[PDB]
Amino acid sequence: GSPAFGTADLSNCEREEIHLAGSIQPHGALLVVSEPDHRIIQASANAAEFLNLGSVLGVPLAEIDGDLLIKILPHLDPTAEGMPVAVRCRIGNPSTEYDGLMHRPPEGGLIIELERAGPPIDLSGTLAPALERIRTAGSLRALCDDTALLFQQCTGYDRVMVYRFDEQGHGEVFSERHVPGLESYFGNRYPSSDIPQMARRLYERQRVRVLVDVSYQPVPLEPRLSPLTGRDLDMSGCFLRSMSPIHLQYLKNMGVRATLVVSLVVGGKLWGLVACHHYLPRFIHFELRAICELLAEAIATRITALESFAQSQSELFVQRLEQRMIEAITREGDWRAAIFDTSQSILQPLHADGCALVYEDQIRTIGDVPSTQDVREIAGWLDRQPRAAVTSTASLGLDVPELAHLTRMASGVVAAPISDHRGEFLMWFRPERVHTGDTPADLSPRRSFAKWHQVVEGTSDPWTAADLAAARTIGQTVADIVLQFRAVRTLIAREQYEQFSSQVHASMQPVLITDAEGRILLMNDSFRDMLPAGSPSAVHLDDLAGFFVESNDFLRNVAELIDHGRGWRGEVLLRGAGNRPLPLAVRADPVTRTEDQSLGFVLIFSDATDRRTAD
Amino acid sequence: GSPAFGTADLSNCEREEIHLAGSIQPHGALLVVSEPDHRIIQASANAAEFLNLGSVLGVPLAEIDGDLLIKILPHLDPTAEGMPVAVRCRIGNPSTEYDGLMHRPPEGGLIIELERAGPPIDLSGTLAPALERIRTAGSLRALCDDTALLFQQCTGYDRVMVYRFDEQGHGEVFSERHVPGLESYFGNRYPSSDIPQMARRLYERQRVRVLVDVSYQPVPLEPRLSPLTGRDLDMSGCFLRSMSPIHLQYLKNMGVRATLVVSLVVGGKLWGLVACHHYLPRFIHFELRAICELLAEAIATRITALESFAQSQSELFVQRLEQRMIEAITREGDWRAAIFDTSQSILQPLHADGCALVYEDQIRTIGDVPSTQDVREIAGWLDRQPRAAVTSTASLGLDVPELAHLTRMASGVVAAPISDHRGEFLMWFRPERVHTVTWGGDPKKPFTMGDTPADLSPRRSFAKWHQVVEGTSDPWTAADLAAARTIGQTVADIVLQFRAVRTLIAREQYEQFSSQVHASMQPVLITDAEGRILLMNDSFRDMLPAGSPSAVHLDDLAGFFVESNDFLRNVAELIDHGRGWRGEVLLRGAGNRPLPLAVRADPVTRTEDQSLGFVLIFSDATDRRTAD
Numbered sequence A: 001g002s003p004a005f006g007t008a009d010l011s012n013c014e015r016e017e018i019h020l021a022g023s024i025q026p027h028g029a030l031l032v033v034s035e036p037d038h039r040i041i042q043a044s045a046n047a048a049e050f051l052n053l054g055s056v057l058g059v060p061l062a063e064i065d066g067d068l069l070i071k072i073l074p075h076l077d078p079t080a081e082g083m084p085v086a087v088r089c090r091i092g093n094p095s096t097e098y099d100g101l102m103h104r105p106p107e108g109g110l111i112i113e114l115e116r117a118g119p120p121i122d123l124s125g126t127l128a129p130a131l132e133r134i135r136t137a138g139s140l141r142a143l144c145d146d147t148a149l150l151f152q153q154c155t156g157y158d159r160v161m162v163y164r165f166d167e168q169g170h171g172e173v174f175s176e177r178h179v180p181g182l183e184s185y186f187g188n189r190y191p192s193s194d195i196p197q198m199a200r201r202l203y204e205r206q207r208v209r210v211l212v213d214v215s216y217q218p219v220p221l222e223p224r225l226s227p228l229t230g231r232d233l234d235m236s237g238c239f240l241r242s243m244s245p246i247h248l249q250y251l252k253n254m255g256v257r258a259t260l261v262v263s264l265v266v267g268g269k270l271w272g273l274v275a276c277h278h279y280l281p282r283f284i285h286f287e288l289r290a291i292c293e294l295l296a297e298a299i300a301t302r303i304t305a306l307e308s309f310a311q312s313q314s315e316l317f318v319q320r321l322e323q324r325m326i327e328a329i330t331r332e333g334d335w336r337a338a339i340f341d342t343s344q345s346i347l348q349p350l351h352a353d354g355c356a357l358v359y360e361d362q363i364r365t366i367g368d369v370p371s372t373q374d375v376r377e378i379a380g381w382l383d384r385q386p387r388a389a390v391t392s393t394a395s396l397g398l399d400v401p402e403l404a405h406l407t408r409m410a411s412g413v414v415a416a417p418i419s420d421h422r423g424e425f426l427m428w429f430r431p432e433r434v435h436t437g438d439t440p441a442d443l444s445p446r447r448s449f450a451k452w453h454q455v456v457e458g459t460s461d462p463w464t465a466a467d468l469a470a471a472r473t474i475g476q477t478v479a480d481i482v483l484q485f486r487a488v489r490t491l492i493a494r495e496q497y498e499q500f501s502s503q504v505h506a507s508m509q510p511v512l513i514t515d516a517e518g519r520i521l522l523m524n525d526s527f528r529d530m531l532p533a534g535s536p537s538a539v540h541l542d543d544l545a546g547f548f549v550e551s552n553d554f555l556r557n558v559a560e561l562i563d564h565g566r567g568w569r570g571e572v573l574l575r576g577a578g579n580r581p582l583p584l585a586v587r588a589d590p591v592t593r594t595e596d597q598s599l600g601f602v603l604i605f606s607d608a609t610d611r612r613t614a615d
Numbered sequence B: 001g002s003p004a005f006g007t008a009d010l011s012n013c014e015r016e017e018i019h020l021a022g023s024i025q026p027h028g029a030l031l032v033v034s035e036p037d038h039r040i041i042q043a044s045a046n047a048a049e050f051l052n053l054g055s056v057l058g059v060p061l062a063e064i065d066g067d068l069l070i071k072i073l074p075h076l077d078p079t080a081e082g083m084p085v086a087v088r089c090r091i092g093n094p095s096t097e098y099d100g101l102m103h104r105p106p107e108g109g110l111i112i113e114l115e116r117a118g119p120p121i122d123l124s125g126t127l128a129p130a131l132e133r134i135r136t137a138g139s140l141r142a143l144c145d146d147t148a149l150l151f152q153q154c155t156g157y158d159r160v161m162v163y164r165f166d167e168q169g170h171g172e173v174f175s176e177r178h179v180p181g182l183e184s185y186f187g188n189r190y191p192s193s194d195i196p197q198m199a200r201r202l203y204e205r206q207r208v209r210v211l212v213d214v215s216y217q218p219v220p221l222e223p224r225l226s227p228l229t230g231r232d233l234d235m236s237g238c239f240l241r242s243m244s245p246i247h248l249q250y251l252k253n254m255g256v257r258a259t260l261v262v263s264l265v266v267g268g269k270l271w272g273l274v275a276c277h278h279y280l281p282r283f284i285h286f287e288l289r290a291i292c293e294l295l296a297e298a299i300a301t302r303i304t305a306l307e308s309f310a311q312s313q314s315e316l317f318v319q320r321l322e323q324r325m326i327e328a329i330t331r332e333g334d335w336r337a338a339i340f341d342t343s344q345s346i347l348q349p350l351h352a353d354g355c356a357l358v359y360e361d362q363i364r365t366i367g368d369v370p371s372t373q374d375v376r377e378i379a380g381w382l383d384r385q386p387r388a389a390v391t392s393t394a395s396l397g398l399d400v401p402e403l404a405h406l407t408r409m410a411s412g413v414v415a416a417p418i419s420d421h422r423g424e425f426l427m428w429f430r431p432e433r434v435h436t437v438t439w440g441g442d443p444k445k446p447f448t449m450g451d452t453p454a455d456l457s458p459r460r461s462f463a464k465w466h467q468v469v470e471g472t473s474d475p476w477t478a479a480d481l482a483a484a485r486t487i488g489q490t491v492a493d494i495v496l497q498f499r500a501v502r503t504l505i506a507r508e509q510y511e512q513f514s515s516q517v518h519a520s521m522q523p524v525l526i527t528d529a530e531g532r533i534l535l536m537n538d539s540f541r542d543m544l545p546a547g548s549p550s551a552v553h554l555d556d557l558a559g560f561f562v563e564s565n566d567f568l569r570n571v572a573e574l575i576d577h578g579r580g581w582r583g584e585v586l587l588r589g590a591g592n593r594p595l596p597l598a599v600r601a602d603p604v605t606r607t608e609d610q611s612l613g614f615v616l617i618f619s620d621a622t623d624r625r626t627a628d
């Protein structure tokens, strides 16, 4: 079901049991020693020759001329914190030093790996100053560039590259140093699947991975199976683990002969590698390996710092945006002038290329954006089914295929609403990121770069959880201040209605203000009181028809006003007693809403006594 | 008492009986005859030697001796009321031709003033090309100036002055034209007291007045009292009637020695005179008087035309104002725009030097005007009691002494309300009228009481003009108060509609804003300053329990909120002091204090020390919390 270790082609190389290769590389020996017994129950086949011993398989370390058992025994104790642990020990008829690495796999026993010791170290600082250059690295690029130059120096490898992984798992050759006379892969990219997950877990677990020679003949582990009725020993943590041929082939295809890959984990997750490649075999001494791990933890630390600092910039942004909306505007009344840069680009916190804002059926944009009709259709998508509070896609085209056409400038969009309205939000865009089965023999970096391109088809850079979080706090700041702003503006409008309104009420003349359909909204006293005081109660300009010399001249004039929107200027009589009482002047006018439908009408009278002059 | 003719001094000559002189000027003779029999019952004592006769008193007119009777008969048919009328005749021993003037006073019989015709009777290129210039005249200034040159030219007289009279009846030498060697009177002014009412009637009535020689000895009427009244003869309409020595002693003091004074009557009222003075005695023949009369009537017309037209422009100004205000800002904002400059002056319609708008409590001026506090002060003064459509004074101190100090700029004020609020007016000002002229008509060297007719004069009358007229502005005329009313009335009507529209607009700009706040999924209340609840969205109402004791005022809303009546201590600290907050809170319900909500209470500000209201915009679980 899952390919045996050195037995898989590309249709299944992802699932390779790379942890259960029953063999090792020949620059060290491997011993698996039993619990209590402390009796070699399983050993690499080069053990005797390599360690200059005779009988090994089935011999307690108590024997094995030397000093191994005594040099490892402190670490098998309640006292210590377990292992992995490295020892320095002597082994032989006459004796030789070795650097031992022992760790316990889940069942199996102790695995002890031995390599031949190297000369001393001194340097001496080298660590101190390099290490503070990591700390001072002004920026992710300045850092990496320096990590690469720095490792190139520390380990004389022909080339070193630091890769960065994206949320997708795809790699990018983020920096690179290489001696003259070689290709340069600086800038390359490669599919997430070029480094299978199981590998990656190991890259997290043990932070250094050495291939001394691409053509090594793997020395098989002996009594292959575990005799503690286990089976294929779990080499998850064996420094001397054989490598998958798939990768071995890759490396031959590149011309590379040796490898040293020290991983970078940042926030407990695997951020990328520092891959040192040599075009002649090569081997770094355990001590120099220790140094490397330190750099990887130092480098990482800065990487975490630099992230944090970015979060700093963003936090500040939203702050200065909130302050900017309250101040800059809303005191100059309304808040949109703050949204756009002029100086503080709302683009940076998402590292987007354009931004659009749709509010009260109006769009304004900054940067590379699609087209108002396009921006509308996206708006449609977001609205057609709830959810909310920040939404994204890095492949709009392939997420809703009718929209595809807008892939060159908005493969990726992030949209955060600013009110519970619908059709009201802030949305950011990114271009198609692409502006920057076979067999085991066909693999290469140019074959990997293309293919990366095949995947990543209609996609933008993905939205980093950092990005999305910025989208959340901005949209959330914006809405909060926009909602307080709308509540307050209601209150002011209330005060402005009341008032204005009173002024009409204070008029000695009769006025009636009505709405577009003709129903009375306001009727001051002056008017009310002239209706021979004593019922009925008018809801519509029609209802008033009777109080004026009966007249369907009022209806009809009112008709003109309601239907047709044209006002009038004439007189009306008004009924009461002897010689049909006093006549008032009237003058109704519409108040425009848009142009085709009105808002309402105001009919003020009045000049009781026939006097504009007249004529 | 009213001093019988030639016995007046400065104290009582405003009533001198000048229509009852008892005299005649020598240049003619006057005969009073009886009806229907025609006998000379009265005659100026020169009647005899003047007319070449032996006797006149007592004798009938047929016996006379010179076609006079014949020459009058066609004018006495009581069908054709010809009178007054001019006749031509011969009379006496050697026959001399006389120009007669007939007329019939209500009292004693029928007057016949004859004077000695002495002319060719000339052609008249003099009339028709004059009337041209007159119907032509563009402005009052042009008409008057020309009328002056024109008289100066027909009559040879040394000085023509057209005088205008203002509403007080004060005189202005509104235009003048004279001769090398003369003091210029041009801008001068004078009291109404200078030319007394009775004397104003004599001019309104009899339209030409002549004095041939100021020294001249009066001729008495014999018997003097009219034999059919026992009283005096109403000489009100006698071309030879003598002249108060008051006004004589004046001309005397000016160096003038003759006068010809044709009257300008507009719309049945004396608008001014055309005064023709001269510095040696003058005679002027009848036909030339006849020309002057015709000239006066032509001008009187023009003058009516001119006002008629000024008026029509006043009207148009107002019609443009209406629109200048309509477009004029309503379609670009407000309206006040139009009232203000806009190179169409709100000052001109009232020949005012300043204007002031006070509205909605703010005040804006233009033109010469008093301080802004002062204007509030005037507006206060205006607001003491109900006024009536337009209000005015031309004497602000004097009428309202509390405001004496405003005299300079606003000795005159006119104001028309533009709403029914009070405090809302449009008002125009005019200065103490002393500050016009600026001709040294009153340096500082008194004076006062007069006196002695030996003191009379221009200097002195110009000065007397200042003494009267002191806390005074040129009067508001009927056109001025005409203007005010219209302008105001229009300003008002546009203001009131405008006010009824923002009320509608302003309403929709609220439903809509409330609907939005409604729209929000978060609970939120907007309250007034005294804590009453105005808005409470369904996203709030729906977090309250079943029965829901409706609700008014925040305080009685801490019933929910796990008592924590520090909600109340918070609400009051917010209302009483105006202190919003940002704490937490915990709502109750099903079943035991499970729903905690964030609250943000914020004051909205009226005044800048008192507050319009509050927004308790809560509102959320704790899914916002808080770093990132």
Ligand SMILES: */C=C/C1=C(C)C(=O)N/C1=C\C1=NC(=C\c2[nH]c(/C=C3/NC(=O)C(C=C)=C3C)c(C)c2CCC(=O)O)/C(CCC(=O)O)=C1C
Binding pocket: A010, A012, A013, A014, A018, A173, A185, A188, A189, A190, A193, A194, A195, A196, A199, A209, A242, A243, A244, A246, A247, A250, A259, A261, A273, A275, A277, A443, A444, A445, A446, A448, A449
């Ligand atoms: C199906 C399995 C694999 C395919 C196909 C493949 O390409 N690699 C596969 C498995 C493993 N890869 C391992 C290490 C590894 N692979 C890459 C891929 C690259 N592609 C590129 O274009 C470039 C540079 C231009 C690289 C480096 C890299 C970078 C690495 C890391 C080691 C190195 O950089 O040399 C791997 C692990 C072997 C081990 O156990 O050490 C497996 C398995």
Ligand SMILES: */C=C/C1=C(C)C(=O)N/C1=C\C1=NC(=C\c2[nH]c(/C=C3/NC(=O)C(C=C)=C3C)c(C)c2CCC(=O)O)/C(CCC(=O)O)=C1C
Binding pocket: B009, B010, B012, B013, B014, B018, B171, B185, B188, B189, B190, B193, B194, B195, B196, B199, B209, B242, B243, B244, B246, B247, B259, B260, B261, B273, B275, B276, B456, B457, B458, B461, B462
């Ligand atoms: C109280 C009696 C009078 C006082 C005092 C007085 O000043 N005038 C009085 C009476 C009459 N005036 C008559 C004619 C007349 N009076 C004036 C006034 C003037 N004031 C001026 O300041 C100037 C010049 C600067 C004048 C002329 C005027 C203007 C006139 C017009 C006639 C003219 O200009 O000659 C009058 C009757 C005259 C008559 O009997 O025909 C009386 C009486």
